[PDB]
Amino acid sequence: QPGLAELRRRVQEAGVPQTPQPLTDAFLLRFLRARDFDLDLAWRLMKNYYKWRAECPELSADLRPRSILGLLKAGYHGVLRSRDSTGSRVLIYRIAYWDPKVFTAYDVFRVSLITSELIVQEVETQRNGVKAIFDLEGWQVSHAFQITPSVAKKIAAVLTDSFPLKVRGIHLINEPVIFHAVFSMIKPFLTEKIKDRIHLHGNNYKSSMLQHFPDILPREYGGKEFSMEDICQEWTNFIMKSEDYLSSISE
Amino acid sequence: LLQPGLAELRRRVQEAGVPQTPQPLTDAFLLRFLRARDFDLDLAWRLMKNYYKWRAECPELSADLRPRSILGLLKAGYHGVLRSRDSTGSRVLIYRIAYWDPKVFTAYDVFRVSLITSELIVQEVETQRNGVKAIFDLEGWQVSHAFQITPSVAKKIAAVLTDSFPLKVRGIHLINEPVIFHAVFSMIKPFLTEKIKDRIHLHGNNYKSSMLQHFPDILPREYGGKEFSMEDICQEWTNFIMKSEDYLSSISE
Amino acid sequence: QPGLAELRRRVQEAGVPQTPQPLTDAFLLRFLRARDFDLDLAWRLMKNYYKWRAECPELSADLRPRSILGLLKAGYHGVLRSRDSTGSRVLIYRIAYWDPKVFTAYDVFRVSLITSELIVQEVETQRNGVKAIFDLEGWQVSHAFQITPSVAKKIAAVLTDSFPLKVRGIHLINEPVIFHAVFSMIKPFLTEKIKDRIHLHGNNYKSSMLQHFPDILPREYGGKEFSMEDICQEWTNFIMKSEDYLSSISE
Amino acid sequence: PGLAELRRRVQEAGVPQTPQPLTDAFLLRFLRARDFDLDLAWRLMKNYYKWRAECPELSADLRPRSILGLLKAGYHGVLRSRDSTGSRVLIYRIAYWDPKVFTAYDVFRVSLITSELIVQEVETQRNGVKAIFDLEGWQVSHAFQITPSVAKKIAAVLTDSFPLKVRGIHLINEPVIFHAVFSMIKPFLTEKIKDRIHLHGNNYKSSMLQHFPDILPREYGGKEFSMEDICQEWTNFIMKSEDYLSSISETI
Numbered sequence A, C: 001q002p003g004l005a006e007l008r009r010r011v012q013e014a015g016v017p018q019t020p021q022p023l024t025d026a027f028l029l030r031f032l033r034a035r036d037f038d039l040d041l042a043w044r045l046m047k048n049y050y051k052w053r054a055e056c057p058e059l060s061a062d063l064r065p066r067s068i069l070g071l072l073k074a075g076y077h078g079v080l081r082s083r084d085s086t087g088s089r090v091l092i093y094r095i096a097y098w099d100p101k102v103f104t105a106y107d108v109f110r111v112s113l114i115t116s117e118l119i120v121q122e123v124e125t126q127r128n129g130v131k132a133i134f135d136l137e138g139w140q141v142s143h144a145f146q147i148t149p150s151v152a153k154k155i156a157a158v159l160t161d162s163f164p165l166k167v168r169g170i171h172l173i174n175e176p177v178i179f180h181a182v183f184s185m186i187k188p189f190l191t192e193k194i195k196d197r198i199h200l201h202g203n204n205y206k207s208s209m210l211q212h213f214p215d216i217l218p219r220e221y222g223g224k225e226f227s228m229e230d231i232c233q234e235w236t237n238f239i240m241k242s243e244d245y246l247s248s249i250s251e
Numbered sequence B: 001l002l003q004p005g006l007a008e009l010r011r012r013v014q015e016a017g018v019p020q021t022p023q024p025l026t027d028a029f030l031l032r033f034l035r036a037r038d039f040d041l042d043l044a045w046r047l048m049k050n051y052y053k054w055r056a057e058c059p060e061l062s063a064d065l066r067p068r069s070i071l072g073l074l075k076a077g078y079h080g081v082l083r084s085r086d087s088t089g090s091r092v093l094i095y096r097i098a099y100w101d102p103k104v105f106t107a108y109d110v111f112r113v114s115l116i117t118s119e120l121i122v123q124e125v126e127t128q129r130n131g132v133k134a135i136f137d138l139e140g141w142q143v144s145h146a147f148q149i150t151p152s153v154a155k156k157i158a159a160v161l162t163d164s165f166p167l168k169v170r171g172i173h174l175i176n177e178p179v180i181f182h183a184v185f186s187m188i189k190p191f192l193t194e195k196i197k198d199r200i201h202l203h204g205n206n207y208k209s210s211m212l213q214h215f216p217d218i219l220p221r222e223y224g225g226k227e228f229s230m231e232d233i234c235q236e237w238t239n240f241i242m243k244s245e246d247y248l249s250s251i252s253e
Numbered sequence D: 001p002g003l004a005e006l007r008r009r010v011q012e013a014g015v016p017q018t019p020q021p022l023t024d025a026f027l028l029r030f031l032r033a034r035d036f037d038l039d040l041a042w043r044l045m046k047n048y049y050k051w052r053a054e055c056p057e058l059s060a061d062l063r064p065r066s067i068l069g070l071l072k073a074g075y076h077g078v079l080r081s082r083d084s085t086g087s088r089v090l091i092y093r094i095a096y097w098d099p100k101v102f103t104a105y106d107v108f109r110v111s112l113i114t115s116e117l118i119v120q121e122v123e124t125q126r127n128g129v130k131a132i133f134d135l136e137g138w139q140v141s142h143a144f145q146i147t148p149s150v151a152k153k154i155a156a157v158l159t160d161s162f163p164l165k166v167r168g169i170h171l172i173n174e175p176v177i178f179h180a181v182f183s184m185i186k187p188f189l190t191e192k193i194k195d196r197i198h199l200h201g202n203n204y205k206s207s208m209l210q211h212f213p214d215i216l217p218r219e220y221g222g223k224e225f226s227m228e229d230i231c232q233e234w235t236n237f238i239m240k241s242e243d244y245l246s247s248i249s250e251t252i
């Protein structure tokens, strides 16, 4: 790979912490692939990733799952069994299974960080990226109370050059009108390729979702072969089985 | 062959001193109000007082009903009326925002097009009985349109729609509407009865099948019909307004 | 009094609820005094009041103060010891002391209903009305989340023709600049007189407020004699002392 | 040092060699704008040329004759003195922008012209600029000119597409709607960036005197000169620079 050992010379001569993430070839590949081996942006992303980590100890330091197990058990999150036509990983998040009384927005954010770290190891996921589907049915004001400006800036960074993962699609379903109306305002001021990656489907999402993701959705969203229950429990399994590797890369 | 409440309405009108010009207080004219409220005399009277109150408060809309000043808008293709009534007998009106040039015409000019049309169709007994449905195609909506809809204009649209014109409004259909219209609808909903809320329909960009449920076999080709085009009915309606200009003069101040 | 006899008769003819608030002459005089003994206006107000009460049982049914005692102890609300120069009762509300995670907009609205039911018993308050000062310092997006269009409609009603108290002044201090844009949207839907009774004073409110309320404000707002904390405590003690009277007029 | 590596990349990447000559002084604008951080300077340089190629209707022509009418009207002046930190201080008056005669692009070109003139000053490269926008007389016709397209260009030029450090943006007499929306945008900006944006409102005299003591025109609190003075002085400087501005413009 053009820049496999080349990039490590920038890593050594800068003084990047060797722990908790061992600076292996397997770890350094994440950053190059995440920018299509553009060595220049790969280095900015690596700096931004560790900058993001040093800025957020309450989030980035701890990847140990046992703390957000209740959320996974409640069925907040599952990853689809298959990749989409572009080979991207497809993730589903379900707002109605987040209890703001029990779990804070930072706990919920950790779930994405955990999943992101496990799937980023997959080569195809590095090349093809991820698409994320947010089912906003069950949105309460108590959820909104949790999304402070500080939380929103962290969502922003992690989706744009602060994590070694291409975001290839953000899909919202069952959003409140208020979400769609505000987004309508910010939409025209966004770049051309970015507003091609954000999709607000509303309540009548059936067919737009099938255009984007044929054959691979759970029954709840128009598919025919499995349910959210299945993939949630499956993904919950994968995370708890990987809890040791997750511990070994924590602080 | 006495009409319920007509004799008494004619007396209340006289005791209150309702303006005799520009529109004469014929039986035909009074009956507009009674029919709009299904012959409930008290409600027809409250309506009739509201109608004159609204007119007096908005003379920059209500005084001049002559079409000449708004001919450009009709020529552009802003407004047409369907040939057929819907299945409940309503007149069906179509307004197309994309043919309103806001550099050229103000919100008040556009509003006058609706007043002119309403004053013409309210002469029909079947329209008095069965009301109107209006379809707004909001494709091509611009910030220039939004800025013309000042809080003042919104109040006069609300005022005129709230018990101030003797036409029953049986349905409002918006198609191709920007998402913000939904937020605006949410803000106004608590001020509406369930009956009225259920008459307002925002269909979105994928409106064709939903709007065909309401208007089978009578829409122009552009909206899923197959017998005529929008252009045909804009021309025909424009024609009719121009032939009615002598009448429209006589009911102007 | 002009119209009391006719009102008594109308009350009887129309089947106005006799419970939980008994239809004494004193109660009927609230409606007459609120409308300067204009019978038709007083009758209209009375009907609007019962209409409002029936539309909003979540607000009107319960005037028991125990559920909102926490808000009163936090220092949300007090009433000035003196009337203003025109004989109006003067109320203070401090948004910083409403925790929207703990109290809903409906709980906060109920505080005003309780206070209003208490002060409307005063003949001078019926004659001279009220002024309310809202200190919006500490306003958060989370206070905004609770002000739905439904709540906005109830607020509008009670300030205009659905509650038998003349509103002689609404003063906002430390209000976010956004309130001015909201005020522009609302103005056409209000008459010249009511718009004239709404005052937004900003962060530098002290001299403009003193023009309206010389000598009577607490120290926090430019007066000299007492603190907000004193008047919150006094008003809390009074609301709780009145708890049986309040229970006696609750459904 | 950092200059040598930048020059290498410039030759390697095929950075356009015209209209502006790629001198050591030209490259130093980019190094100084990012305090000699080579990665940041090179990124800035790349963004600058990218911005020019996407916006040739703005970037190709810096000749001032097309916008002399706007200068003569009193739209724009530069303070005779730098501020206490050495920044160049620019004043824009929306009242004197007739949006029927000049587009937002015309008005934007004035700022491009002023910027290409002051970036030549070493102390300006080092200490950046402050800009004051007097929004008295803001009309709906101005807002119509500010499309999303224009908004994106303004954001780019203020952030990472022009080699001038923006040290402060001051708005005075702004309508409520600027303040209302900005208050919604405020919490999402960084701490450093938020401390560089200042909305003074209608009562601005004291707080403006704080940031710029003894250097402002009479109109904004000073005593030594008028806006009209510095408008005319700046207009005459721009026009005396018209050959220079041609030399850094593409051919016609």
Ligand SMILES: CCCC(=O)OC[C@H](COP(=O)(O)O[C@@H]1[C@H](O)[C@H](O)[C@@H](OP(=O)(O)O)[C@H](OP(=O)(O)O)[C@H]1O)OC(=O)CCC
Pocket (backbone or CB within 6 Å): A176, A177, A178, B182, B183, B184, B185, B186, B187, B189, C144, C145, C146, C147, C148, C149, C150
């Ligand atoms: C300025 C934006 C106004 C706005 O969006 O305002 C909306 C929000 C939420 O308000 P709500 O009272 O919690 O919920 C509303 C009621 O359930 C209503 O009865 C229902 O309509 P219906 O089902 O009876 O027809 C509405 O459905 P939609 O119309 O959304 O689909 C629902 O929204 O408030 C704001 O977010 C407050 C914070 C600013």
Ligand SMILES: Cc1c(C)c2c(c(C)c1O)CC[C@@](C)(CCC[C@H](C)CCC[C@H](C)CCCC(C)C)O2
Pocket (backbone or CB within 6 Å): A105, A106, A108, A109, A112, A113, A116, A130, A131, A132, A134, A147, A154, A155, A158, A159, A163, A165, A166, A167, A170
């Ligand atoms: C690397 C990575 C992370 C870390 C990630 C996501 C993706 C696609 C990633 O690639 C998507 C979700 C997110 C940003 C976590 C969001 C946490 C919040 C608390 C979710 C709850 C509610 C939101 C109001 C829902 C809308 C979110 C979308 C607009 C992204 O975390």
Ligand SMILES: Cc1c(C)c2c(c(C)c1O)CC[C@@](C)(CCC[C@H](C)CCC[C@H](C)CCCC(C)C)O2
Pocket (backbone or CB within 6 Å): B107, B108, B110, B111, B114, B115, B118, B132, B134, B136, B149, B157, B160, B161, B165, B167, B168, B169, B172
């Ligand atoms: C008697 C009568 C009148 C007078 C009338 C209408 C109807 C159904 C009537 O029966 C509907 C249209 C309206 C209110 C005129 C509207 C004029 C404005 C300027 C149109 C442009 C833009 C609107 C923001 C689009 C949507 C409006 C709907 C929500 C009504 O005039």
Ligand SMILES: Cc1c(C)c2c(c(C)c1O)CC[C@@](C)(CCC[C@H](C)CCC[C@H](C)CCCC(C)C)O2
Pocket (backbone or CB within 6 Å): C105, C106, C108, C109, C112, C113, C116, C130, C132, C134, C147, C155, C158, C159, C163, C165, C167, C170
């Ligand atoms: C009889 C009566 C009631 C019942 C009353 C008030 C007055 C003057 C009355 O005379 C004023 C306050 C109000 C309308 C309750 C307000 C409840 C809300 C939830 C307060 C919080 C936030 C408001 C967005 C702050 C601004 C309020 C003013 C614009 C009124 O309750």
Ligand SMILES: Cc1c(C)c2c(c(C)c1O)CC[C@@](C)(CCC[C@H](C)CCC[C@H](C)CCCC(C)C)O2
Pocket (backbone or CB within 6 Å): D104, D105, D107, D108, D111, D112, D115, D129, D130, D131, D133, D146, D154, D157, D158, D162, D164, D165, D166, D169
């Ligand atoms: C290199 C450079 C350029 C090129 C520049 C500015 C500055 C400080 C620069 O360093 C400031 C102004 C701007 C961005 C051009 C503005 C053009 C528009 C059409 C002005 C009119 C109206 C604005 C909506 C007023 C407020 C703008 C502030 C929010 C910046 O051009």
